[PDB]
Amino acid sequence: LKAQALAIETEAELQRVQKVRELELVYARAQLELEVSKAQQLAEVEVKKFKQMTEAIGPSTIRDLAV
Amino acid sequence: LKAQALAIETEAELQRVQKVRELELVYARAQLELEVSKAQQLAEVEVKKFKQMTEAIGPSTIRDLAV
């Protein structure tokens, strides 16, 4: 009888754990997508501002400015 | 009976968690869009002011001004 009751409550636990982890996996995938989108856009505007600034100052001057 | 009641309250919890996380994902996506818009506009006006100033002072003078 203990075996029958443990079988029922184990099936009932495992279905809930399956559904919760499935929806959590979908939501974590969407958060990852938004995360890398923000990372690459902020990296792109950083790269573009740096490129325009070191273009406007000239790469020859930065060769002999740090010392 | 414990299994039936856990199934009902698990379905009822998971629908709410699904809807809350979906609308939160939409709102976080919009905040990311506004965030990168502000970052790139302030970076653009920084780059443009720096370029005009180092144009007006001349890149030859900044070669021999730091020392």
Task: Tell if the CB–CB gap between B51 and A49 is shorter than 8 Å.
Answer: no
Structural contact between residues A61 and B61, judged by C-beta atoms closer than 8 angstroms: no
Question: How many contiguous H segments (helices) and E segments (strands) does chain A have?
Answer: 2, 0
Structural contact between residues A62 and B63, judged by C-beta atoms closer than 8 angstroms: no
Task: Tell if the CB–CB gap between A45 and B46 is shorter than 8 Å.
Answer: no
CA B21 to CA A28: how far, in whole Å? 10
Phi, psi of B34 (to 5 degrees): -65, -35
Alpha helices in chain B (DSSP H): 2-57, 59-63
Q: Which residues contact B25 (CB under 8 A, 6 or more apart)?
A: A27, A30, A31, A34
CA B48 to CA B41: how far, in whole Å? 11
